[PDB]
Amino acid sequence: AGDIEVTGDSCNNYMLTYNKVENMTPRDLGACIDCSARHINAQVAKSHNIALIWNVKDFMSLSEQLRKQIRSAAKKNNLPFKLTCATTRQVVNVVTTKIALK
């Protein structure tokens, strides 16, 4: 694979709405809920200059299938994807959707 930027600020565990919920395995769905991952619209993220900042341990908890799907969606939409060891969450100033089946 290769290089991802590593930042030191808070994470958001945001993933694009292109990664549909019904297309994940029960394992990856549980991992997203366990790390409180949220859905954000791509054009919504681009206007607010929002980057995809994932906690390293939380990103690791996802299957490699979904891990590649998230970074591929960010690249497709010219959105930066970052990793961090920070566990503090980004203050949410943009509308996002909780990932669940509800």
XYZ file of all heavy atoms in Angstrom:
791
model
N 0.825 -1.209 0.000
C 0.000 0.000 0.000
C 0.859 1.258 0.000
O 1.579 1.525 -0.970
C -0.933 -0.003 1.197
N 0.789 2.044 1.060
C 1.774 3.083 1.243
C 1.238 4.277 2.003
O 0.193 4.224 2.647
N 1.974 5.372 1.844
C 2.053 6.477 2.789
C 0.702 7.093 3.133
O -0.078 7.453 2.244
C 2.975 7.546 2.204
C 4.420 7.088 2.109
O 4.886 6.327 2.984
O 5.082 7.479 1.127
N 0.455 7.250 4.435
C -0.656 8.026 4.976
C -0.081 9.056 5.941
O 0.894 8.775 6.647
C -1.690 7.132 5.696
C -2.153 5.986 4.796
C -2.873 7.955 6.187
C -2.741 4.817 5.561
N -0.678 10.245 5.972
C -0.183 11.287 6.863
C -0.570 10.972 8.302
O -1.689 10.530 8.578
C -0.732 12.659 6.465
C -0.487 13.747 7.513
C -0.846 15.134 7.017
O -0.363 15.521 5.931
O -1.590 15.853 7.719
N 0.366 11.190 9.220
C 0.139 10.988 10.646
C 0.126 12.355 11.318
O 1.131 13.077 11.292
C 1.205 10.074 11.269
C 1.096 10.092 12.788
C 1.062 8.658 10.741
N -1.006 12.709 11.916
C -1.173 13.970 12.622
C -1.223 13.725 14.125
O -1.285 12.586 14.595
C -2.442 14.696 12.155
O -2.459 16.027 12.686
C -3.685 13.953 12.622
N -1.196 14.818 14.884
C -1.200 14.723 16.330
C -2.452 15.270 16.987
O -2.595 15.194 18.211
N -3.368 15.820 16.193
C -4.575 16.415 16.742
C -5.680 15.367 16.863
O -5.488 14.180 16.586
C -5.027 17.599 15.888
C -5.703 18.686 16.710
O -5.118 19.115 17.727
O -6.821 19.109 16.342
N -6.858 15.821 17.279
C -7.965 14.925 17.575
C -8.453 14.212 16.319
O -8.323 14.711 15.199
C -9.120 15.705 18.205
O -8.660 16.514 19.273
N -9.023 13.031 16.522
C -9.608 12.258 15.442
C -11.109 12.518 15.354
O -11.729 13.077 16.261
C -9.345 10.767 15.647
S -10.146 10.078 17.119
N -11.693 12.100 14.235
C -13.141 12.098 14.078
C -13.707 10.747 13.678
O -14.916 10.539 13.843
C -13.578 13.146 13.041
C -12.722 13.123 11.788
O -12.471 12.065 11.210
N -12.273 14.297 11.357
N -12.883 9.823 13.176
C -13.341 8.518 12.697
C -14.468 8.678 11.679
O -15.422 7.899 11.642
C -13.766 7.618 13.860
C -12.592 7.175 14.711
O -11.439 7.473 14.399
N -12.876 6.457 15.794
N -14.353 9.712 10.850
C -15.332 9.969 9.808
C -15.055 9.089 8.599
O -13.901 8.870 8.219
C -15.301 11.439 9.385
C -15.899 12.410 10.381
C -15.686 13.777 10.251
C -16.678 11.966 11.443
C -16.228 14.675 11.152
C -17.225 12.860 12.351
C -16.995 14.211 12.199
O -17.533 15.107 13.095
N -16.123 8.580 7.998
C -16.028 7.865 6.738
C -17.137 8.362 5.824
O -18.203 8.775 6.288
C -16.095 6.344 6.949
C -17.422 5.695 6.614
S -17.383 3.921 6.949
C -16.710 3.901 8.609
N -16.862 8.350 4.523
C -17.793 8.919 3.560
C -19.053 8.069 3.453
O -19.042 6.863 3.718
C -17.133 9.049 2.186
C -16.342 10.323 1.860
C -15.591 10.866 3.068
C -15.384 10.073 0.704
N -20.153 8.716 3.061
C -21.413 8.009 2.861
C -21.353 7.030 1.698
O -22.241 6.179 1.581
C -22.555 9.005 2.636
O -22.223 9.885 1.555
C -22.805 9.825 3.895
N -20.334 7.134 0.839
C -20.159 6.163 -0.235
C -19.935 4.760 0.316
O -20.326 3.776 -0.320
C -18.994 6.594 -1.132
C -18.422 5.507 -2.018
C -18.953 5.259 -3.278
C -17.331 4.748 -1.608
C -18.429 4.274 -4.096
C -16.802 3.760 -2.418
C -17.353 3.528 -3.660
O -16.828 2.547 -4.470
N -19.318 4.649 1.491
C -19.164 3.364 2.173
C -20.489 3.040 2.854
O -20.721 3.385 4.014
C -18.017 3.412 3.177
C -16.721 3.904 2.562
O -16.278 5.021 2.828
N -16.105 3.070 1.733
N -21.370 2.364 2.120
C -22.716 2.103 2.608
C -22.693 1.153 3.799
O -21.792 0.322 3.948
C -23.585 1.523 1.493
C -24.093 2.559 0.503
C -25.000 1.929 -0.538
C -26.349 1.568 0.059
N -27.377 1.338 -0.994
N -23.712 1.278 4.653
C -23.760 0.487 5.877
C -24.105 -0.966 5.569
O -23.506 -1.892 6.132
C -24.754 1.113 6.873
C -25.259 0.072 7.861
C -24.102 2.274 7.605
N -25.064 -1.195 4.669
C -25.487 -2.560 4.372
C -24.386 -3.388 3.716
O -24.472 -4.620 3.722
C -26.732 -2.543 3.482
C -26.539 -1.840 2.147
C -27.757 -1.951 1.247
O -28.751 -2.587 1.657
O -27.719 -1.399 0.127
N -23.356 -2.750 3.169
C -22.279 -3.456 2.488
C -21.139 -3.856 3.416
O -20.136 -4.398 2.939
C -21.729 -2.603 1.340
C -22.710 -2.469 0.191
O -23.611 -3.293 0.028
N -22.541 -1.423 -0.612
N -21.251 -3.605 4.716
C -20.222 -4.024 5.654
C -20.599 -5.359 6.283
O -21.776 -5.715 6.375
C -19.995 -2.991 6.762
C -20.141 -1.537 6.349
S -19.826 -0.440 7.752
C -21.450 -0.293 8.480
N -19.580 -6.095 6.715
C -19.803 -7.324 7.450
C -20.284 -7.002 8.862
O -20.074 -5.893 9.360
C -18.518 -8.147 7.513
O -17.555 -7.467 8.328
C -17.944 -8.349 6.119
N -20.952 -7.952 9.521
C -21.301 -7.745 10.936
C -20.102 -7.412 11.810
O -20.244 -6.673 12.793
C -21.939 -9.083 11.332
C -22.493 -9.624 10.056
C -21.552 -9.181 8.972
N -18.918 -7.929 11.468
C -17.712 -7.618 12.229
C -17.344 -6.145 12.107
O -17.090 -5.472 13.112
C -16.556 -8.498 11.752
C -15.408 -8.616 12.738
C -14.432 -9.699 12.307
N -13.912 -10.445 13.445
C -13.885 -11.769 13.521
N -14.335 -12.529 12.535
N -13.396 -12.346 14.615
N -17.299 -5.628 10.876
C -16.912 -4.235 10.676
C -17.971 -3.272 11.193
O -17.634 -2.180 11.666
C -16.632 -3.972 9.198
C -15.382 -4.668 8.712
O -14.426 -4.791 9.507
O -15.353 -5.089 7.537
N -19.249 -3.648 11.101
C -20.302 -2.825 11.686
C -20.110 -2.683 13.190
O -20.225 -1.581 13.737
C -21.673 -3.423 11.360
C -22.956 -2.657 11.711
C -23.468 -3.054 13.085
C -22.747 -1.152 11.649
N -19.802 -3.786 13.874
C -19.557 -3.707 15.304
C -18.332 -2.878 15.644
O -18.320 -2.155 16.643
N -17.286 -2.971 14.821
C -16.083 -2.185 15.071
C -16.350 -0.695 14.899
O -15.798 0.131 15.637
C -14.954 -2.640 14.144
N -17.197 -0.330 13.933
C -17.523 1.078 13.730
C -18.317 1.633 14.906
O -18.061 2.753 15.362
C -18.299 1.255 12.425
S -17.315 1.010 10.928
N -19.283 0.862 15.408
C -20.051 1.289 16.574
C -19.156 1.375 17.805
O -19.298 2.287 18.629
C -21.239 0.335 16.802
C -22.083 0.219 15.529
C -22.077 0.796 17.989
C -23.474 -0.337 15.756
N -18.218 0.433 17.949
C -17.365 0.416 19.134
C -16.444 1.629 19.190
O -16.067 2.068 20.283
C -16.540 -0.870 19.175
C -15.896 -1.105 20.528
O -16.596 -0.963 21.553
O -14.690 -1.429 20.568
N -16.068 2.177 18.038
C -15.221 3.359 17.980
C -16.002 4.619 17.624
O -15.392 5.663 17.372
C -14.082 3.142 16.982
S -14.568 3.192 15.244
N -17.334 4.536 17.594
C -18.202 5.691 17.351
C -17.872 6.375 16.025
O -17.779 7.600 15.943
C -18.128 6.687 18.512
O -18.911 6.247 19.608
N -17.687 5.574 14.979
C -17.483 6.122 13.647
C -18.773 6.759 13.139
O -19.877 6.362 13.516
C -17.017 5.031 12.684
N -18.625 7.762 12.274
C -19.773 8.517 11.791
C -19.675 8.722 10.287
O -18.585 8.722 9.708
C -19.893 9.872 12.502
C -20.374 9.766 13.941
C -20.595 11.135 14.564
N -21.877 11.712 14.178
C -23.034 11.425 14.759
N -23.111 10.560 15.758
N -24.143 12.019 14.326
N -20.837 8.896 9.662
C -20.938 9.125 8.228
C -20.960 10.618 7.928
O -21.631 11.392 8.618
C -22.205 8.470 7.674
C -21.964 7.152 7.007
N -22.978 6.258 6.738
C -20.827 6.581 6.543
C -22.475 5.191 6.145
N -21.172 5.363 6.013
N -20.229 11.019 6.891
C -20.220 12.405 6.440
C -20.289 12.427 4.919
O -19.624 11.637 4.240
C -18.982 13.171 6.960
C -19.100 14.661 6.627
C -17.688 12.579 6.408
C -17.937 15.494 7.112
N -21.114 13.325 4.386
C -21.240 13.462 2.943
C -19.959 14.045 2.360
O -19.340 14.936 2.949
C -22.440 14.345 2.600
C -22.593 14.576 1.110
O -21.963 15.467 0.538
N -23.440 13.776 0.472
N -19.560 13.529 1.194
C -18.279 13.913 0.604
C -18.237 15.403 0.288
O -17.317 16.113 0.711
C -18.014 13.086 -0.654
N -19.227 15.895 -0.461
C -19.281 17.320 -0.773
C -19.443 18.159 0.487
O -18.920 19.277 0.560
C -20.420 17.605 -1.753
C -20.506 16.627 -2.917
C -21.325 15.392 -2.589
O -20.782 14.298 -2.428
N -22.640 15.561 -2.495
N -20.159 17.639 1.485
C -20.260 18.328 2.768
C -18.884 18.462 3.407
O -18.527 19.524 3.935
C -21.250 17.587 3.689
C -21.032 17.975 5.129
C -22.681 17.882 3.280
N -18.081 17.396 3.352
C -16.753 17.436 3.953
C -15.813 18.362 3.192
O -14.952 19.006 3.802
C -16.166 16.026 4.023
N -15.957 18.443 1.867
C -15.052 19.272 1.078
C -15.297 20.755 1.325
O -14.349 21.548 1.357
C -15.197 18.942 -0.408
C -13.962 18.303 -1.026
C -12.922 19.350 -1.400
C -11.925 18.807 -2.412
N -11.172 19.902 -3.085
N -16.560 21.148 1.505
C -16.872 22.558 1.719
C -16.372 23.039 3.075
O -15.879 24.165 3.197
C -18.377 22.787 1.592
O -19.010 22.708 2.858
N -16.494 22.205 4.104
C -16.039 22.550 5.443
C -14.562 22.248 5.663
O -14.077 22.408 6.789
C -16.877 21.809 6.491
C -18.065 22.581 6.975
N -17.955 23.663 7.822
C -19.388 22.423 6.737
C -19.159 24.141 8.082
N -20.047 23.405 7.437
N -13.845 21.820 4.624
C -12.426 21.477 4.716
C -12.179 20.451 5.821
O -11.263 20.577 6.635
C -11.572 22.729 4.926
C -11.600 23.660 3.731
O -11.010 23.371 2.689
N -12.294 24.784 3.874
N -13.022 19.425 5.845
C -12.923 18.360 6.835
C -12.082 17.231 6.261
O -12.331 16.761 5.144
C -14.315 17.854 7.244
C -15.148 18.995 7.834
C -14.196 16.702 8.232
C -14.694 19.440 9.207
N -11.082 16.800 7.020
C -10.258 15.660 6.657
C -10.704 14.426 7.433
O -11.300 14.520 8.508
C -8.779 15.948 6.928
N -10.411 13.260 6.865
C -10.716 11.985 7.511
C -9.560 11.653 8.445
O -8.492 11.223 8.003
C -10.937 10.890 6.474
C -12.379 10.619 6.033
C -13.154 11.910 5.809
C -12.405 9.753 4.784
N -9.768 11.858 9.742
C -8.745 11.631 10.757
C -9.210 10.479 11.635
O -10.156 10.623 12.418
C -8.476 12.888 11.592
C -8.222 14.090 10.678
C -7.297 12.660 12.524
C -8.280 15.422 11.394
N -8.543 9.337 11.512
C -8.907 8.132 12.239
C -7.866 7.822 13.305
O -6.660 7.952 13.069
C -9.040 6.940 11.289
C -10.404 6.783 10.695
C -10.958 7.534 9.698
C -11.386 5.806 11.054
N -12.226 7.086 9.417
C -12.512 6.025 10.237
C -11.424 4.768 11.990
C -13.662 5.245 10.326
C -12.566 3.993 12.076
C -13.670 4.238 11.250
N -8.337 7.416 14.480
C -7.439 6.876 15.487
C -6.841 5.568 14.984
O -7.541 4.734 14.404
C -8.185 6.657 16.804
C -7.326 5.985 17.856
O -7.392 4.771 18.043
N -6.518 6.774 18.555
N -5.533 5.400 15.198
C -4.821 4.252 14.637
C -5.420 2.946 15.144
O -5.677 2.017 14.368
C -3.318 4.343 14.959
C -2.627 3.021 14.656
C -2.675 5.479 14.179
N -5.653 2.854 16.455
C -6.196 1.623 17.020
C -7.595 1.342 16.486
O -7.949 0.184 16.229
C -6.209 1.709 18.546
C -6.350 0.365 19.240
C -6.608 0.542 20.726
C -5.454 1.265 21.404
N -5.778 2.688 21.706
N -8.403 2.390 16.308
C -9.745 2.209 15.766
C -9.698 1.791 14.300
O -10.449 0.904 13.878
C -10.551 3.496 15.936
C -10.827 3.826 17.394
O -10.687 2.925 18.250
O -11.182 4.989 17.683
N -8.826 2.422 13.509
C -8.660 2.016 12.116
C -8.183 0.573 12.021
O -8.604 -0.170 11.126
C -7.683 2.958 11.411
C -7.670 2.816 9.913
C -8.814 3.055 9.169
C -6.507 2.456 9.247
C -8.803 2.928 7.790
C -6.488 2.330 7.868
C -7.638 2.566 7.139
N -7.313 0.155 12.945
C -6.833 -1.223 12.959
C -7.961 -2.212 13.217
O -7.939 -3.330 12.689
C -5.751 -1.391 14.026
C -4.386 -0.888 13.615
S -4.137 -0.956 11.836
C -2.529 -0.188 11.721
N -8.946 -1.824 14.030
C -10.028 -2.733 14.388
C -10.899 -3.101 13.194
O -11.625 -4.098 13.261
C -10.889 -2.112 15.489
O -11.645 -1.022 14.991
N -10.843 -2.329 12.115
C -11.603 -2.646 10.917
C -10.883 -3.701 10.089
O -9.652 -3.798 10.098
C -11.820 -1.394 10.067
C -12.224 -0.115 10.798
C -12.283 1.045 9.819
C -13.559 -0.299 11.499
N -11.669 -4.501 9.371
C -11.095 -5.440 8.419
C -10.347 -4.683 7.329
O -10.685 -3.546 6.989
C -12.190 -6.306 7.797
O -12.765 -5.653 6.677
N -9.309 -5.323 6.781
C -8.564 -4.688 5.701
C -9.452 -4.387 4.501
O -9.183 -3.421 3.778
C -7.372 -5.557 5.291
C -7.728 -6.964 4.872
C -7.514 -7.966 5.989
O -8.415 -8.102 6.844
O -6.441 -8.605 6.021
N -10.509 -5.175 4.285
C -11.462 -4.872 3.221
C -12.015 -3.460 3.379
O -11.911 -2.630 2.469
C -12.609 -5.891 3.216
C -12.278 -7.315 2.763
C -11.086 -7.920 3.467
O -9.972 -7.905 2.945
N -11.308 -8.432 4.671
N -12.610 -3.172 4.539
C -13.188 -1.852 4.766
C -12.115 -0.775 4.862
O -12.345 0.364 4.436
C -14.040 -1.865 6.035
C -14.763 -0.564 6.393
C -15.822 -0.241 5.351
C -15.378 -0.654 7.784
N -10.946 -1.113 5.414
C -9.862 -0.141 5.519
C -9.483 0.415 4.152
O -9.313 1.630 3.992
C -8.649 -0.781 6.194
C -8.691 -0.751 7.712
C -7.324 -1.042 8.301
N -7.083 -2.472 8.449
C -6.048 -3.114 7.926
N -5.136 -2.482 7.205
N -5.926 -4.422 8.131
N -9.348 -0.461 3.150
C -9.069 0.002 1.794
C -10.247 0.763 1.198
O -10.045 1.689 0.406
C -8.703 -1.182 0.895
C -7.229 -1.562 0.901
C -7.000 -2.900 1.590
C -7.689 -4.036 0.846
N -7.738 -5.283 1.667
N -11.478 0.389 1.559
C -12.646 1.051 0.986
C -12.760 2.493 1.467
O -13.188 3.373 0.710
C -13.917 0.271 1.332
C -14.214 -0.894 0.397
C -15.249 -1.849 0.966
O -15.914 -1.544 1.957
N -15.385 -3.014 0.343
N -12.382 2.754 2.719
C -12.477 4.107 3.258
C -11.451 5.017 2.593
O -11.780 6.112 2.122
C -12.311 4.090 4.788
C -13.549 3.481 5.450
C -12.062 5.494 5.317
C -13.291 2.938 6.838
N -10.192 4.574 2.539
C -9.147 5.393 1.933
C -9.373 5.582 0.440
O -9.019 6.632 -0.110
C -7.777 4.768 2.194
C -7.254 5.012 3.599
C -6.181 4.010 3.982
N -5.190 3.835 2.928
C -4.618 2.678 2.625
N -4.915 1.568 3.281
N -3.726 2.633 1.640
N -9.959 4.588 -0.232
C -10.233 4.723 -1.659
C -11.324 5.754 -1.917
O -11.261 6.498 -2.903
C -10.624 3.368 -2.248
O -10.333 3.311 -3.633
N -12.332 5.813 -1.045
C -13.386 6.810 -1.202
C -12.853 8.216 -0.966
O -13.243 9.159 -1.665
C -14.543 6.506 -0.251
N -11.960 8.376 0.015
C -11.371 9.685 0.278
C -10.524 10.154 -0.898
O -10.566 11.333 -1.269
C -10.533 9.635 1.555
N -9.746 9.245 -1.493
C -8.943 9.599 -2.660
C -9.825 9.914 -3.861
O -9.537 10.847 -4.621
C -7.971 8.463 -2.982
C -6.722 8.878 -3.756
C -6.991 9.147 -5.231
C -5.980 10.122 -5.807
N -6.476 10.832 -7.018
N -10.899 9.145 -4.050
C -11.795 9.380 -5.177
C -12.407 10.775 -5.119
O -12.623 11.410 -6.158
C -12.896 8.319 -5.201
C -12.582 7.102 -6.051
C -13.712 6.086 -5.978
C -14.999 6.644 -6.567
N -14.897 6.864 -8.037
N -12.690 11.269 -3.913
C -13.322 12.566 -3.723
C -12.321 13.659 -3.360
O -12.726 14.722 -2.875
C -14.411 12.467 -2.654
C -15.604 11.652 -3.113
O -16.581 12.197 -3.627
N -15.530 10.339 -2.932
N -11.028 13.417 -3.585
C -9.972 14.392 -3.304
C -10.016 14.861 -1.852
O -9.793 16.035 -1.550
C -10.047 15.582 -4.264
C -9.418 15.281 -5.611
O -8.740 14.267 -5.778
N -9.643 16.161 -6.580
N -10.305 13.932 -0.943
C -10.357 14.222 0.477
C -9.151 13.619 1.174
O -8.827 12.447 0.932
C -11.646 13.669 1.095
C -12.254 14.479 2.239
C -12.440 15.932 1.833
C -13.574 13.870 2.674
N -8.462 14.371 2.029
C -7.301 13.808 2.727
C -7.724 12.826 3.809
O -8.755 12.998 4.464
C -6.610 15.038 3.327
C -7.674 16.072 3.422
C -8.670 15.798 2.334
N -6.912 11.786 3.984
C -7.102 10.790 5.028
C -5.867 10.776 5.918
O -4.740 10.677 5.421
C -7.351 9.400 4.434
C -7.436 8.305 5.464
C -8.633 8.025 6.100
C -6.318 7.555 5.792
C -8.715 7.020 7.045
C -6.392 6.549 6.738
C -7.592 6.281 7.365
N -6.085 10.867 7.228
C -5.011 10.978 8.204
C -5.198 9.940 9.301
O -6.309 9.469 9.560
C -4.969 12.381 8.825
C -4.847 13.513 7.819
C -4.646 14.848 8.524
C -4.889 16.013 7.583
N -4.417 15.701 6.205
N -4.089 9.591 9.948
C -4.088 8.719 11.113
C -3.529 9.479 12.308
O -2.737 10.413 12.154
C -3.259 7.453 10.867
C -3.830 6.429 9.884
C -2.917 5.215 9.784
C -5.234 6.014 10.291
N -3.949 9.074 13.505
C -3.507 9.728 14.725
C -3.600 8.744 15.879
O -4.389 7.795 15.843
C -4.343 10.982 15.030
O -3.855 11.620 16.218
C -5.803 10.612 15.231
N -2.778 8.967 16.898
C -2.907 8.230 18.148
C -3.742 8.977 19.176
O -3.985 8.440 20.261
C -1.525 7.909 18.736
S -0.427 7.026 17.604
N -4.168 10.199 18.872
C -5.037 10.935 19.779
C -6.365 10.209 19.951
O -6.948 9.705 18.987
C -5.278 12.351 19.253
N -6.836 10.144 21.196
C -8.147 9.581 21.487
C -9.213 10.645 21.691
O -10.405 10.314 21.678
C -8.083 8.685 22.732
O -7.594 9.440 23.848
C -7.168 7.492 22.487
N -8.818 11.901 21.880
C -9.782 12.989 21.931
C -10.483 13.131 20.585
O -9.899 12.894 19.526
C -9.091 14.301 22.304
O -8.265 14.733 21.216
C -8.229 14.116 23.542
N -11.752 13.520 20.633
C -12.569 13.628 19.437
C -12.616 15.069 18.945
O -12.566 16.018 19.733
C -13.990 13.118 19.697
C -14.053 11.644 20.066
C -13.287 10.795 19.062
N -13.757 9.414 19.034
C -13.150 8.405 19.644
N -12.043 8.587 20.347
N -13.665 7.182 19.545
N -12.701 15.220 17.627
C -12.848 16.536 17.025
C -14.184 17.148 17.424
O -15.217 16.476 17.418
C -12.758 16.436 15.502
C -11.362 16.606 14.932
C -11.381 17.068 13.488
O -12.272 16.702 12.721
N -10.397 17.874 13.110
N -14.161 18.432 17.782
C -15.409 19.135 18.047
C -16.205 19.222 16.750
O -15.684 19.614 15.697
C -15.142 20.511 18.682
C -14.172 20.363 19.843
C -14.577 21.500 17.676
N -17.462 18.796 16.807
C -18.267 18.583 15.611
C -18.998 19.880 15.286
O -19.920 20.284 16.000
C -19.248 17.419 15.796
C -19.860 17.029 14.464
C -18.544 16.226 16.420
N -18.580 20.536 14.205
C -19.242 21.729 13.699
C -19.993 21.470 12.403
O -20.530 22.412 11.811
C -18.222 22.853 13.487
C -17.001 22.708 14.375
O -17.098 22.780 15.600
N -15.842 22.504 13.760
N -20.042 20.221 11.948
C -20.676 19.852 10.690
C -21.577 18.651 10.943
O -21.260 17.791 11.772
C -19.624 19.547 9.601
C -18.745 18.368 10.009
C -20.287 19.293 8.267
N -22.709 18.599 10.243
C -23.668 17.522 10.458
C -23.082 16.204 9.966
O -22.610 16.096 8.826
C -25.001 17.837 9.766
C -24.761 18.316 8.353
C -25.896 16.607 9.762
N -23.100 15.198 10.836
C -22.678 13.849 10.500
C -23.740 12.870 10.979
O -24.592 13.202 11.806
C -21.317 13.503 11.123
O -21.317 13.863 12.510
C -20.200 14.253 10.412
N -23.684 11.653 10.445
C -24.662 10.618 10.749
C -23.977 9.471 11.477
O -22.896 9.032 11.075
C -25.338 10.107 9.472
O -25.920 11.210 8.765
C -26.427 9.099 9.806
N -24.607 8.994 12.549
C -24.083 7.859 13.294
C -24.211 6.585 12.463
O -25.254 6.336 11.851
C -24.829 7.714 14.620
C -24.807 6.317 15.225
C -25.706 6.242 16.453
C -25.536 4.927 17.200
N -24.660 3.974 16.468
N -23.149 5.788 12.433
C -23.158 4.530 11.692
C -23.812 3.459 12.555
O -23.293 3.098 13.616
C -21.740 4.114 11.275
C -21.234 4.998 10.135
C -21.714 2.654 10.847
C -19.739 5.207 10.152
N -24.954 2.954 12.101
C -25.703 1.920 12.807
C -26.738 1.358 11.840
O -26.846 1.796 10.690
C -26.364 2.463 14.075
N -27.501 0.377 12.317
C -28.597 -0.192 11.545
C -29.960 0.315 11.989
O -30.865 0.421 11.153
C -28.571 -1.722 11.633
C -27.525 -2.420 10.759
C -27.086 -3.734 11.386
C -28.057 -2.645 9.351
N -30.107 0.638 13.276
C -31.322 1.193 13.895
C -32.631 0.914 13.155
O -33.551 1.731 13.172
C -31.164 2.709 14.081
C -30.796 3.481 12.822
C -30.556 4.952 13.133
C -30.533 5.795 11.868
N -29.287 5.585 11.080
